[PDB]
Amino acid sequence: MKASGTLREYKVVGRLLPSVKNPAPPLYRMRIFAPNHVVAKSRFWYFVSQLRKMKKASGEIVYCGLVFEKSPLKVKNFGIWLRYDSRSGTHNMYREYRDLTTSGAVTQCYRDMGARHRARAHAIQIMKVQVIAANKCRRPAIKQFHDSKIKFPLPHRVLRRQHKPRFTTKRPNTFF
Amino acid sequence: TNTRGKRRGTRYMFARPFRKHGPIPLSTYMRIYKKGDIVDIKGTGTIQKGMPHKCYHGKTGRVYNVTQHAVGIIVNKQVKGKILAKRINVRIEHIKHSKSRDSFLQRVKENEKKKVEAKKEGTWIELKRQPAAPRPAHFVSTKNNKPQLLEPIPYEF
Amino acid sequence: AKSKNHTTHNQSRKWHRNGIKKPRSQRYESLKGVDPKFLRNMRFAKKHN
Amino acid sequence: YRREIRMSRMARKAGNYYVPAEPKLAFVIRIRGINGVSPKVRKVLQLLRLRQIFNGVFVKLNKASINMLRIAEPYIAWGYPNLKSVRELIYKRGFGKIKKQRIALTDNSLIEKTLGQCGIICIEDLIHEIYTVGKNFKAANNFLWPFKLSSPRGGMNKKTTHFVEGGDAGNREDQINRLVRRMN
Amino acid sequence: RRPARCYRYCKNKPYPKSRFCRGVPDPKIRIFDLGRKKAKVDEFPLCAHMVSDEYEQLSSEALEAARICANKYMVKTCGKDGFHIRVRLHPFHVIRINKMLSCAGADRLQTGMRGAFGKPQGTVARVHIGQVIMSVRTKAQNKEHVIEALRRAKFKFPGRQKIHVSKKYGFTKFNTCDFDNMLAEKRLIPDGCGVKYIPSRGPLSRWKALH
RNA sequence: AGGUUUUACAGCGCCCUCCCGCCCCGACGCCGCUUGCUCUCCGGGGCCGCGG
RNA sequence: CCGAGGUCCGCGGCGACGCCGGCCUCCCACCCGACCCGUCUUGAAACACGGACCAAGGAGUCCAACGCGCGCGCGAGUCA
RNA sequence: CUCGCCGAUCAAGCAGUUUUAUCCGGUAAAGCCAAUGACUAGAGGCACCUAUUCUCAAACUUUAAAUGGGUAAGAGGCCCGGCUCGCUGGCGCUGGAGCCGGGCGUGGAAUGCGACGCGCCUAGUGGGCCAUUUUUGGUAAGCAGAACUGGUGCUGCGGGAUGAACCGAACGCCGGGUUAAGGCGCCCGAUGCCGACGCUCAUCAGACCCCAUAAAAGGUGUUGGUUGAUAUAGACAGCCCGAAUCAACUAGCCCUGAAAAUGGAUGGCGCUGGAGCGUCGGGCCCAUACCCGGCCGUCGACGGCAGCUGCAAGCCUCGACGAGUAGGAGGGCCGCCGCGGUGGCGCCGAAGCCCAGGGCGCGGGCCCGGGUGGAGCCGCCG
RNA sequence: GCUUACGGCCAUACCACCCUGGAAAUGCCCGAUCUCAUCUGAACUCGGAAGUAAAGCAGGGUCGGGCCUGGUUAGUACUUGGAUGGGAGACCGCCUGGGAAUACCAGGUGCUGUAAGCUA
Ligand SMILES: [Mg+2]
Ligand SMILES: [Mg+2]
Ligand SMILES: [Mg+2]
Ligand SMILES: [Mg+2]
Ligand SMILES: [Mg+2]
Ligand SMILES: [Mg+2]
Ligand SMILES: [Mg+2]
Ligand SMILES: [Mg+2]
Ligand SMILES: [Mg+2]
Ligand SMILES: [Mg+2]
Ligand SMILES: [Mg+2]
Ligand SMILES: [Mg+2]
Ligand SMILES: [Mg+2]
Ligand SMILES: [Mg+2]
Ligand SMILES: [Mg+2]
Ligand SMILES: [Mg+2]
Ligand SMILES: [Mg+2]
Ligand SMILES: [Mg+2]
Ligand SMILES: [Mg+2]
Ligand SMILES: [Mg+2]
Ligand SMILES: [Mg+2]
Ligand SMILES: [Mg+2]
Ligand SMILES: [Mg+2]
Ligand SMILES: [Mg+2]
Ligand SMILES: [Mg+2]
Ligand SMILES: [Mg+2]
Ligand SMILES: [Mg+2]
Ligand SMILES: [Mg+2]
Ligand SMILES: [Mg+2]
Ligand SMILES: [Mg+2]
Ligand SMILES: [Mg+2]
Ligand SMILES: [Mg+2]
Ligand SMILES: [Mg+2]
């Protein structure tokens, strides 16, 4: 997996190929976060083939569609349970994020797992994504934005547009 | 370098299966091998007479000559970059009837069985074999089969 | 002054250059090596039909 | 097009799922070069009529064809073309093989002269017989010279990697149409 | 001898002391079980391993040195009869050494790489990733001493090792959460240091002997 | 945790209904995939029209 | 005429060298590229060998016999 | 040369490829509580004996892959009748084989391709080297020796600063377009995006295949994470105070570990809200690659001809293609000397030589002009 | 159903122990004159018919051993092909496909051809 751009959520369901010995085999639904549906279908045959005895050729994919955010305009606290393989071993890890959409929070997790732990997208296995209430948040970086009447300035504004005037008699102001 | 012995490296191919030693079952002796039939070559270490060479163990050819205890086979053998038709003499204990063409002869009789029905019914049922076609469109019911949510399990050392 | 002993490195590319042709199984294959008693009677069955 | 929507709608209304028929047509584009090819992959690309980079062919999808596409996977980028892909490829890049020659499909007389026995007398017959594969797909597809496609306008992600892991090789289900609009 | 950097990686096929490899010196380690080895299963419930993280080969001298390092710390912290250390790696791969290559000579049949196949030098234990090196079973309250005893013995080994407190009961292959339940059902009987699995698929006379 | 205890001198959820209460905007500078042949004397830039 | 690939049934300033033209070649300048050829060699710009420069000379021939292919004459003959 | 296309994928036939069917194997793995051999520990029973147990095999194996090897997927078939035999024999039909005649295309997997068809003659080479993987000897080697495939030798081009072999891509002469691999602070084409989030300070920072070294072990540097334990019956720390604290472990970057000789190397400059590290987005830059077109030649054509041409060895049309050492073949209105013919040239200036003159040909070379020179010379067919 | 003759596959058929059964048949059994045969009529060979189930044989039994089949192990181990993936390395992850074995658990335990005979 590459995790190109945003990691949209896909509901990929699948089942073994039906036969006369086993007609109507059980259906398995997965919660796959992938950049596109082609990778979502491929991620499905990676997590399911290691849980059940069914490969891509042994079974088929019944449905693979987008799972849209039910509240894109509400700030939510996301608790993500994941496991990643570091250079030494595999570690279970729980991380909290705060985004508007579930796919946005999972996308933050891949950017954060690679930044803080040098984990590549193929080494990360998102196990559980859950909308956590503000009472049940464990990370202090998330709980600081759980303050009503929150107030903070924007100190020391770094100058962007450094090349619109590339040369100028005015030194930029950083206080606003 | 290696030796050019006729049985170098045949420690396991000419050996007998586990708990399958002893005398050769006599049904293998009473099998009729005519001329032109497809036979396999599987040497046996029990019968040290008329053994095929290790290069023919696992090969398949047709019979051209039949004798008292053996049979003449025309086998293909690639030496370096050319394939040659080898006429080898192998006793019947090291060969068996090849079921490779049996699936073809079964289809030939079945093709002639289904096309004479067309001359008597007036249909055009296709006789050609076809590769596995893409799966047709089907409905997957969830009446008593709800999709079960699977999740990757945590790591355990 | 030692050299290289044995190699089959470039041989496969040389074999398939002109192709690995299978032996042409011509119709009415020859009767060399058949049982002399069988051939003797077969030549008697041809000079009398 | 409307039938597959009706079948998908009636299954969801009952709470079930409608699995569409697996695609019967594929469009294979050779993405890797010609130097340094494995002899097994090299033989497969010759049987797919893909002897140079960035050329395309239509492949009737069956187990005999899919296992040839899997055995030449790192050198191709194939998928399931839609009608617009099949239509625009035969219109803009469509060249017929009249007498072992690459002749542009400028008139229907060139299709009727070669594929007239198969009932294919117009260029829409050639599009219909390929998009919806028929009893004469082999003669129709083999009549079409390998589509000489241009370089992908906008570049590729990375050529030496499979499409799922962030590259472009392998099988992209319907994303091959995005690649056709940029190469055709 | 030659430093362990030269015989660290499993580069050759396993070369055991056998009919063909004659002349192997005795391995440095000859004792693999120490402590109160004649203890019952219910006496040492806890079990901790020294799991190997790398695919390498540990010399018999390192297995002997780490055994002594782990043994001495268990005696001073748990008593000589409060543990049972089991070195679970037997050195069977024989490493070879070439001749003492010198300038030249009119004898020795060679001077350089001519006839380079060397004589047996020592013995190493080819360990795999996840393979247990040493196992120690102790009482439940001696967990801190076993982790430290195995931690000190890692410095006598190359590569990376992990100290893992197993969920199995002692040196058996049954979890602690299932061990005491199987003793009540007479499915396991104490046999020396461990238990012997008794299925329900034998002669019924053996079932009557248990009840 | 706004107002003085859960709506009050702000608001934020989650259920039961009310024709889905009913109307209105359909991926729309809040977020996807495409024509079921997308339509345009529909604009602009560059390159060259060789032959006969 | 969106049709078997271009035409103008459009046009301007200079035209007897003063102020016009000359690709390449000469000199000079700049940008980019660019190590010395030959030879043996797995590998040469090589700290491998030969070569300071120029002219002239300088190395697959002829004979015998053979093989195959081809041209030719005649043909169970053919060659004097 | 035999054909096929011509004369209808007519169909055969073929394949470094699949599919279907059918066999072959003893390697990886696994196993030894199964045999052979090796090996640890107790326990039970009257040193052994029984039931267990730890750890192994390349010259061990019950078991057993992946990849792979062979064969079969039709008219050379299938079915039927008659006849022949000295072979075979209870049984001229008992086998068997041969011969002859008749019946039945829905050519009875996919894809591709004119048959890499049948010959003859034949040079060069017979020092190789390298890479992924597999693999033997060796402490190791830019060591030595193998296996598959590619590359290279024989090969330039874009990129890796540099380079034989890495990455991309193989090459007629060009224009436009777009890419690959790799890049876009400056050298140096392109981010002069109001790029996203985080990590990171180094008094030896770091800076991307091959690749141009660094480890064990440590850090109360810093950021994550895991698992416990005390806490408003008042903890931790400090000597009562009043709210979180403590411990172990682990993982990133950084730090220690970390010493060589001429002065020096992320390529250089330099870069620290970055020009560093990780995860990514958009745009952009150009290879002899791809696409379109022009031209040259080669090849093919299931090709075209008995106002202009028709030197048929000519002319015209269409399509594809173009690297190359050793080597082979072809073409030459390339060049040189002489001969048989033929057509000329020359004291109004031949040959040769010289030229900042005009040109032709892809090229070998050639023509013309000017100067010098002073007596011979050239074209064409052989 | 059963008893024999010849078999086919060659343990689902073997091995241990226990129980049951003689209608025909089989076996044991009764003898050594002849054929034959040995140290020895035990065997072999021959002659026979007093007894009828002790053994053979057959059929049952055993939470039987073994064997057979399936499940589990396990989509694990390993493995085709791919990357300018990670890591100092050892090695590991992913992509694309193929895919084991023991322990453990469960079931089963001869099938059948030709010929002759018999309904305890
Ligand atoms: Mg030998
Ligand atoms: Mg010999
Ligand atoms: Mg003999
Ligand atoms: Mg020598
Ligand atoms: Mg040699
Ligand atoms: Mg040699
Ligand atoms: Mg390459
Ligand atoms: Mg590659
Ligand atoms: Mg000039
Ligand atoms: Mg030389
Ligand atoms: Mg040299
Ligand atoms: Mg040098
Ligand atoms: Mg010199
Ligand atoms: Mg000269
Ligand atoms: Mg000769
Ligand atoms: Mg030769
Ligand atoms: Mg030679
Ligand atoms: Mg070497
Ligand atoms: Mg070459
Ligand atoms: Mg090259
Ligand atoms: Mg470099
Ligand atoms: Mg260009
Ligand atoms: Mg650069
Ligand atoms: Mg460290
Ligand atoms: Mg220290
Ligand atoms: Mg740290
Ligand atoms: Mg450092
Ligand atoms: Mg072109
Ligand atoms: Mg060339
Ligand atoms: Mg002369
Ligand atoms: Mg000059
Ligand atoms: Mg009895
Ligand atoms: Mg049993």
Side-chain angles (χ1 to χ4, degrees):
Chain A
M1 186 183 175
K2 181 66 181 307
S4 301
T6 175
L7 293 191
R8 316 178 186 274
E9 180 182 358
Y10 291 88
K11 181 175 62 178
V12 189
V13 314
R15 70 189 175 106
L16 200 65
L17 285 180
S19 60
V20 293
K21 182 61 62 181
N22 182 20
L27 276 65
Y28 298 114
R29 176 178 57 90
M30 210 78 192
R31 188 174 180 181
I32 298 291
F33 297 89
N36 53 84
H37 60 279
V38 176
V39 185
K41 291 184 179 180
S42 179
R43 285 276 87 185
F44 179 83
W45 293 120
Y46 168 76
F47 295 112
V48 174
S49 63
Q50 64 187 10
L51 291 178
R52 299 298 184 273
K53 183 182 296 302
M54 45 184 302
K55 302 183 302 175
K56 183 182 177 179
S58 298
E60 69 172 359
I61 284 182
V62 182
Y63 170 85
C64 177
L66 279 170
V67 180
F68 309 119
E69 186 65 35
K70 284 297 172 296
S71 59
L73 308 186
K74 301 182 184 179
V75 190
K76 292 169 295 301
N77 307 317
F78 292 91
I80 298 182
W81 291 261
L82 69 146
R83 56 192 292 255
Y84 81 111
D85 298 67
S86 58
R87 300 166 193 176
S88 302
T90 308
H91 311 271
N92 296 323
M93 176 171 301
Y94 167 79
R95 309 193 68 89
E96 295 183 353
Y97 297 92
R98 175 159 156 158
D99 197 83
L100 289 184
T101 63
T102 300
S103 60
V106 179
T107 311
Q108 294 180 17
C109 189
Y110 279 76
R111 307 294 183 265
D112 182 65
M113 284 300 298
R116 284 189 162 92
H117 305 289
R118 303 308 195 265
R120 276 65 177 179
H122 69 268
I124 305 170
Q125 297 185 2
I126 297 298
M127 306 181 303
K128 192 190 311 299
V129 182
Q130 180 179 347
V131 179
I132 307 301
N135 303 268
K136 285 83 180 180
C137 287
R138 314 203 292 106
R139 305 311 175 192
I142 300 300
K143 298 176 59 181
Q144 66 176 358
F145 298 101
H146 295 169
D147 167 64
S148 177
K149 306 177 302 181
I150 177 180
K151 167 183 298 182
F152 57 90
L154 301 181
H156 191 281
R157 301 303 294 272
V158 190
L159 173 77
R160 300 310 164 181
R161 274 292 190 81
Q162 303 173 3
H163 299 80
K164 180 67 177 302
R166 178 173 279 199
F167 314 95
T168 172
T169 66
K170 280 182 161 298
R171 293 179 180 267
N173 177 30
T174 65
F175 182 90
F176 300 101
Chain B
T1 58
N2 285 324
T3 77
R4 56 179 187 88
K6 302 171 189 177
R7 294 184 62 172
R8 175 183 62 82
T10 62
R11 173 172 184 172
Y12 303 98
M13 57 157 51
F14 290 164
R16 289 187 77 127
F18 179 69
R19 284 173 48 249
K20 293 294 181 180
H21 297 258
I24 304 284
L26 266 65
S27 58
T28 73
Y29 290 89
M30 54 185 63
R31 294 189 187 279
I32 280 76
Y33 299 97
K34 296 182 179 180
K35 184 178 66 63
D37 51 356
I38 314 298
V39 294
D40 304 281
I41 307 177
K42 183 177 180 179
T44 303
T46 300
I47 304 302
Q48 295 82 18
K49 302 285 291 300
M51 301 188 63
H53 199 248
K54 44 182 170 173
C55 58
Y56 308 112
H57 184 97
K59 304 303 177 299
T60 307
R62 66 182 179 277
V63 178
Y64 78 97
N65 182 27
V66 190
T67 54
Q68 285 75 14
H69 313 97
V71 123
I73 317 179
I74 304 173
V75 199
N76 288 332
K77 171 184 173 58
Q78 179 178 350
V79 187
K80 294 180 178 57
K82 56 177 181 180
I83 304 176
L84 302 176
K86 305 288 291 179
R87 295 175 183 263
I88 68 180
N89 302 124
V90 180
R91 295 176 78 99
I92 64 179
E93 304 89 26
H94 313 286
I95 67 176
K96 62 179 180 300
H97 282 290
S98 179
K99 302 178 181 179
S100 304
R101 202 185 173 91
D102 296 1
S103 174
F104 172 70
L105 298 178
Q106 177 189 359
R107 193 174 70 259
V108 170
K109 304 303 180 59
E110 187 177 359
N111 286 337
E112 303 296 332
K113 186 187 89 292
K114 290 185 295 181
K115 64 159 41 180
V116 297
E117 184 269 353
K119 287 297 181 300
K120 204 176 181 181
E121 181 69 22
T123 57
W124 197 358
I125 166 181
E126 298 181 2
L127 303 176
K128 296 193 177 181
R129 297 176 300 168
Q130 296 296 331
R135 285 189 293 265
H138 52 273
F139 290 81
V140 178
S141 178
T142 66
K143 185 179 179 62
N144 295 322
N145 198 346
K146 253 60 181 180
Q148 303 183 21
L149 177 64
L150 298 186
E151 296 181 359
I153 60 177
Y155 174 75
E156 180 185 10
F157 181 72
Chain C
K2 294 171 61 178
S3 57
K4 190 165 191 177
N5 308 279
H6 161 76
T7 331
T8 51
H9 167 61
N10 193 31
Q11 303 320 294
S12 183
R13 290 187 291 185
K14 297 168 55 186
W15 299 338
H16 298 78
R17 208 84 63 88
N18 302 328
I20 302 184
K21 313 177 190 62
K22 289 184 178 59
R24 175 76 284 275
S25 63
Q26 193 75 14
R27 177 178 166 82
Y28 296 141
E29 199 172 11
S30 181
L31 292 169
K32 181 190 61 56
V34 205
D35 195 19
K37 178 187 296 298
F38 170 82
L39 290 181
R40 203 180 85 96
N41 175 77
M42 188 199 63
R43 300 178 186 185
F44 288 148
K46 291 182 176 180
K47 63 182 299 180
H48 289 287
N49 54 7
Chain D
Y1 176 78
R2 302 306 303 181
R3 196 188 317 273
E4 300 178 358
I5 303 171
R6 171 178 175 259
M7 297 296 182
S8 300
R9 284 170 167 177
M10 64 177 55
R12 297 176 301 174
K13 184 165 299 183
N16 311 327
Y17 302 97
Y18 169 74
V19 182
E22 289 187 330
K24 53 189 182 178
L25 181 69
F27 185 66
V28 189
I29 309 173
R30 179 170 183 176
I31 54 175
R32 302 285 284 267
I34 65 168
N35 32 27
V37 188
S38 174
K40 180 173 291 295
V41 181
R42 183 171 64 257
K43 187 60 172 55
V44 176
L45 298 179
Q46 295 167 7
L47 302 183
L48 296 179
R49 297 188 305 172
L50 301 180
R51 290 180 172 269
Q52 75 168 348
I53 185 183
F54 296 146
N55 53 10
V57 294
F58 292 109
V59 173
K60 177 173 50 181
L61 281 181
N62 48 34
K63 188 171 185 175
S65 301
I66 292 178
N67 292 346
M68 290 181 57
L69 298 179
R70 177 183 300 105
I71 209 168
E73 171 182 326
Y75 283 70
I76 64 183
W78 61 287
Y80 312 137
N82 52 7
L83 177 66
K84 182 174 181 177
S85 301
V86 181
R87 174 179 178 84
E88 288 189 344
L89 283 165
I90 307 180
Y91 272 137
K92 184 181 179 185
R93 306 288 189 178
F95 285 69
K97 185 203 301 180
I98 306 303
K99 304 172 285 81
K100 299 188 187 303
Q101 292 183 12
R102 186 175 181 265
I103 299 299
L105 300 180
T106 59
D107 189 55
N108 294 328
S109 180
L110 303 176
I111 299 98
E112 186 269 346
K113 184 181 180 180
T114 299
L115 302 182
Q117 302 289 346
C118 309
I120 299 177
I121 63 178
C122 65
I123 195 167
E124 291 292 330
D125 272 319
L126 190 59
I127 296 178
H128 177 263
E129 197 73 295
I130 287 183
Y131 173 69
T132 61
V133 313
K135 306 303 179 60
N136 303 320
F137 178 87
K138 180 178 185 179
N141 186 32
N142 196 23
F143 166 77
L144 279 182
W145 199 277
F147 297 92
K148 306 307 182 60
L149 302 182
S150 178
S151 299
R153 177 178 58 258
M156 298 178 301
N157 311 281
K158 58 192 312 301
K159 193 165 58 179
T160 63
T161 330
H162 188 260
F163 177 81
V164 164
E165 42 179 0
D168 52 16
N171 169 251
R172 44 179 79 179
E173 268 62 23
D174 54 356
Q175 305 306 127
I176 198 61
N177 302 321
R178 291 190 181 183
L179 187 61
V180 170
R181 306 304 137 82
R182 291 162 44 245
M183 297 183 61
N184 181 23
Chain E
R1 62 180 179 94
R2 192 169 286 175
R5 308 178 286 95
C6 310
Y7 309 98
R8 175 176 180 174
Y9 302 144
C10 304
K11 299 184 63 60
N12 294 334
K13 281 178 182 62
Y15 192 50
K17 170 184 177 181
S18 58
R19 179 220 322 179
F20 321 96
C21 181
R22 299 179 177 182
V24 181
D26 295 70
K28 186 59 178 60
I29 173 173
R30 298 305 303 266
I31 302 175
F32 298 91
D33 287 15
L34 294 86
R36 188 153 63 97
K37 64 184 69 175
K38 303 177 182 57
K40 300 307 177 183
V41 212
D42 55 323
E43 297 183 2
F44 295 145
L46 190 76
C47 180
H49 306 283
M50 180 182 305
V51 190
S52 180
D53 187 276
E54 302 183 2
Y55 174 69
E56 53 181 349
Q57 45 191 23
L58 307 178
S59 60
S60 59
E61 298 83 354
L63 296 167
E64 210 285 333
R67 180 266 307 276
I68 297 185
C69 175
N71 178 32
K72 287 184 177 177
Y73 189 85
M74 290 305 301
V75 176
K76 65 169 56 181
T77 56
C78 300
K80 57 176 182 300
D81 292 82
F83 63 98
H84 175 206
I85 300 181
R86 179 190 294 263
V87 181
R88 298 181 62 182
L89 277 181
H90 293 58
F92 291 145
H93 181 65
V94 179
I95 58 180
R96 305 185 295 268
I97 181 175
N98 199 16
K99 319 299 181 305
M100 307 307 298
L101 306 179
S102 55
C103 59
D107 202 68
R108 298 171 53 180
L109 190 135
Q110 54 81 24
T111 175
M113 295 297 295
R114 178 190 303 272
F117 193 82
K119 312 304 176 183
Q121 175 183 357
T123 51
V124 302
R126 314 181 103 206
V127 69
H128 297 250
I129 300 180
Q131 184 174 4
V132 180
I133 302 176
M134 303 174 57
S135 287
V136 181
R137 57 161 192 164
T138 56
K139 307 172 185 178
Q141 74 280 5
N142 298 129
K143 184 180 64 61
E144 300 296 332
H145 305 294
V146 182
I147 298 180
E148 183 64 25
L150 296 175
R151 191 201 61 85
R152 297 191 173 194
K154 296 188 307 179
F155 299 93
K156 307 295 180 296
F157 285 140
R160 173 187 171 96
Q161 288 73 23
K162 295 181 178 177
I163 311 307
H164 174 254
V165 177
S166 179
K167 293 185 179 181
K168 302 298 182 59
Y169 194 99
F171 284 170
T172 64
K173 61 180 182 181
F174 305 95
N175 308 123
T176 303
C177 52
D178 298 81
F179 185 81
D180 298 72
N181 181 266
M182 296 172 71
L183 291 186
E185 302 184 10
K186 305 304 294 297
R187 191 168 290 99
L188 300 178
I189 58 162
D191 192 342
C193 66
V195 297
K196 181 153 61 183
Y197 182 80
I198 297 188
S200 306
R201 283 285 297 180
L204 193 56
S205 63
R206 193 262 295 269
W207 175 90
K208 295 183 177 182
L210 299 176
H211 305 256

